[PDB]
Amino acid sequence: VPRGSHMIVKNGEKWMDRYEIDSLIGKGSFGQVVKAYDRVEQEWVAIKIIKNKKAFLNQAQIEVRLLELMNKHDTEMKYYIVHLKRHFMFRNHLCLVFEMLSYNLYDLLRNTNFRGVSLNLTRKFAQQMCTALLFLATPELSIIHCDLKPENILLCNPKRSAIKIVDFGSSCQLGQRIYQYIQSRFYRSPEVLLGMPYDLAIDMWSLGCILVEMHTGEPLFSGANEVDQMNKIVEVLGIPPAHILDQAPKARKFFEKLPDGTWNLKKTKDEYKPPGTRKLHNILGVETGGPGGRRAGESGHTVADYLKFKDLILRMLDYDPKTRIQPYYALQHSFFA
Numbered sequence: 323v324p325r326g327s328h329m330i331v332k333n334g335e336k337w338m339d340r341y342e343i344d345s346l347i348g349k350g351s352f353g354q355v356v357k358a359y360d361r362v363e364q365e366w367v368a369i370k371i372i373k374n375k376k377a378f379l380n381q382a383q384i385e386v387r388l389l390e391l392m393n394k395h396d397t398e399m400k401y402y403i404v405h406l407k408r409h410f411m412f413r414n415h416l417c418l419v420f421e422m423l424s425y426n427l428y429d430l431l432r433n434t435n436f437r438g439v440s441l442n443l444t445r446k447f448a449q450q451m452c453t454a455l456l457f458l459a460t461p462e463l464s465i466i467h468c469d470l471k472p473e474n475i476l477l478c479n480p481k482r483s484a485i486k487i488v489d490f491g492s493s494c495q496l497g498q499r500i501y502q503y504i505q506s507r508f509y510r511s512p513e514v515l516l517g518m519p520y521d522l523a524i525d526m527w528s529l530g531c532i533l534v535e536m537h538t539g540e541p542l543f544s545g546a547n548e549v550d551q552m553n554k555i556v557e558v559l560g561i562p563p564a565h566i567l568d569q570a571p572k573a574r575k576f577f578e579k580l581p582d583g584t585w586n587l588k589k590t591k592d593e594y595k596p597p598g599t600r601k602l603h604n605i606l607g608v609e610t611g612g613p614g615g616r617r618a619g620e621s622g623h624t625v626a627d628y629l630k631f632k633d634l635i636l637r638m639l640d641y642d643p644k645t646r647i648q649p650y651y652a653l654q655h656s657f658f659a
């Protein structure tokens with residue numbers, strides 16, 4: 323019986339006279355993902371190997387249940403989610419066989435030298451991700467991904483715009499509270515930072531953050547920690563509404579209620595732009611040739627195009643989860659017309 327939690331995998335070895343292990347795709351907290359040739363089906367697969375650890379096995383069994391649940395639906399919309407081909411036990415590890423995809427949206431930004439992709443390619447990723455969120459919002463699914471980020475959205479093919487969402491390891495269904503900290507820090511919604519109840523709207527917050535980054539090359543809100551995260555959100559969006567802060571268990575982690583009942587920023591121990599003064603209109607460069615002026619004298623980057631983009635994003639970054647744009651309405655926005 324091995325002492326470590328990790329599976330020993332040798333490049334070149336063959337599993338169950340079927341899977342020819344080529345190479346490591348990537349390592350994560352769950353374990354690892356290997357590229358392998360399935361000699362029976364004659365196709366590449368990405369094998370997700372789970373560590374022999376109780377916490378990770380439990381998360382992976384939730385992931386298998388939610389992916390199999392999604393697979394029973396007929397809609398074309400389900401193809402924006404990575405396809406789980408099968409699962410088995412091997413050398414006492416749970417192994418998930420997925421279709422082979424291509425590189426993630428972070429690798430795509432790094433290949434631009436973090437200068438961002440075009441507004442036209444941003445629109446394509448936006449439309450697909452809004453359709454995927456509409457699929458998860460199907461009542462019989464009601465899945466919250468809870469970990470959207472550029473690294474969890476993958477191109478299907480290196481030369482094409484088609485994308486799929488991966489990793490439902492942190493995911494839950496509407497009304498569940500399972501894990502103490504959810505969402506990646508940069509993509510973490512204000513209701514989660516404030517310790518308020520969360521629903522599918524947290525994923526639309528994450529998507530708003532991701533789409534600005536895909537076009538600018540840089541994260542919109544790059545907090546070093548939760549206080550810094552909230553402060554960078556406030557730079558762009560101002561002080562959250564009183565009706566939210568008055569109900570937030572963790573309001574006093576970031577803010578203070580003054581004698582007149584209005585909220586300000588909590589004093590530092592002893593630096594940010596004043597609240598709401600880092601305008602998204604200037605981050606995107608709506609009137610000034612897009613990010614860093616670099617889109618002036620290219621087509622597909624008009625002031626009219628940028629205003630439609632800015633308006634959709636600001637509806638995705640609504641502080642109020644009950645009024646934040648829902649996937650069904652985001653798809654009807656003039657940005658997609």
Ligand SMILES: Cc1cc2cc(-c3cc(N)nc(N)c3)ccc2o1
Nearest residue numbers: 347368420421422423424488489490
């Ligand atoms: C190239 C490539 C990487 C890759 C990664 C996954 C995958 C990774 C994780 N963590 N969770 C899920 N549900 C899928 C699937 C196919 C893949 O294809």
